[PDB]
Amino acid sequence: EVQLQQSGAELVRPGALVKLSCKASGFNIKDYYMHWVKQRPEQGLELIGWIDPENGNTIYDPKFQDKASITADTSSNTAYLQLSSLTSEDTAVYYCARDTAAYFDYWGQGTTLTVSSAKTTPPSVYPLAPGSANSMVTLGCLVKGYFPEPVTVTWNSGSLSSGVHTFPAVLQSDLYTLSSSVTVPSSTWPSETVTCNVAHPASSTKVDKKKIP
């Protein structure tokens, strides 16, 4: 299968210099044009430029002519994206994509770049049980005070999909706060064992919080 693995979430300070990577597998990048795209929170797609690994040739959307510098290593099947003089304006999700020449048939999972002075901080995870209360039973998880984005939240380690709602994080202070809700039938909550799993890679934090009344 054709895949494109991108480097992990990165938090760096203003004025720094980064170089994100996009590693191909299942095909040879020497054969395609690879592209880089930027996408800010709840906003559109913006191409930065592309490269032809064969000869090393590149072309950039003029907006990025002095911000970005795309490179490739045919040996390692890897494409890079360098961004200099970082500002908060550069904080966003970056994607690499293969261009067959008719469309973009493969996209990397994307890399989350945060430009800020804030320090990495693990979240606290507080279970949210009813405490009062009946056909349905809703309970939630509360991920408070982590930085930078993002965090992932699962229940029973993946088991139980529907009846799930994870709300987008908001800045409660210098940090992020996020909540998630699950909805299992009455008989379950009690007897069963409902837990939420949190992952905050940026601080190699993993946590499981068993719900309790």
Binding site: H35, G44, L45, E46, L47, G49, W50, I59, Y60, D61, P62, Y95, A101, A102, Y103, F104, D105, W107, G108, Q109, G110, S124, Y126, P127, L128, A129, P130, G131, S132, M136, T138, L139, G140, L142, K144, S162, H165, T166, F167, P168, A169, V170, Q172, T177, L178, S179, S181, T183
Partner: protein, 204 residues
């Protein structure tokens, strides 16, 4: 730099209805245009290429028309899982450019939320801070007011609201309202309540 004007910015239709999205290029791109679909927190997925060709795995109800400088994406029989943002991209010449996109939403039938107020936790209280999260789940339309009442009155402290994107299955929206407080400020008053417009749920 060939510019791409995409239209409309956002729109809604009821299931079954058909929507048409358009993109116009600043010059003739000779059908070297493609459409994409992007759902929330997800990467984009190719929909059409060469103006009219469907991509693999893509349904029939998605079709592309136009030529020259004018192009359009038509989705005939609208499905609740069609909620997303669509982008056109032109490769008539480098640098290639995307349209500003169209945010498409499903126009279903009114639906009241399912509220669930939650009391701060001990571990949280273990730290000088308390939060009272309220969940308003699966409702439509998306707009809604959220009011909190400490005991019987409304006093300033701190409220934060977060909405999920539209549901692929039932086409509803969900929101969380979290009342923030300092531990000791919480250990005073007694009847906390979150209202929605009314609808109420509370605890002592």
């Amino acid at each position: 730099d060939i510019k791409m004007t995409q239209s409309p910015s956002s729109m809604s239709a009821s299931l079954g209805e058909s929507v048409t999205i358009t993109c116009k290029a600043s010059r003739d791109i000779k059908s070297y245009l493609s459409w994409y679909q992007q759902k929330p927190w997800k990467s984009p997925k190719t929909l059409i290429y060469y103006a009219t060709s469907l991509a693999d795995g893509v349904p029939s109800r998605f079709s592309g028309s136009g030529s020259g400088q004018d192009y359009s994406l038509t989705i005939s029989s609208l499905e609740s899982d069609d909620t997303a943002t669509y982008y056109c991209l032109q490769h008539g010449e480098s640098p290639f450019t995307f349209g500003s996109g169209t945010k498409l939403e499903l126009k279903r039938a009114d639906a009241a939320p399912t509220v669930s107020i939650f009391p701060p936790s001990s571990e949280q209280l273990t730290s000088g801070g308390a939060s009272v999260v309220c969940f308003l789940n699966n409702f439509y339309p998306k707009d809604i007011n959220v009011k909190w009442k400490i005991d019987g009155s409304e006093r300033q402290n701190g409220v934060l609201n977060s909405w999920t994107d539209q549901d692929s299955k039932d086409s509803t929206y969900s929101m969380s309202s979290t009342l923030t407080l300092t531990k000791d400020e919480y250990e005073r008053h007694n009847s906390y309540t979150c209202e929605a417009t009314p609808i109420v749920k509370s605890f002592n």
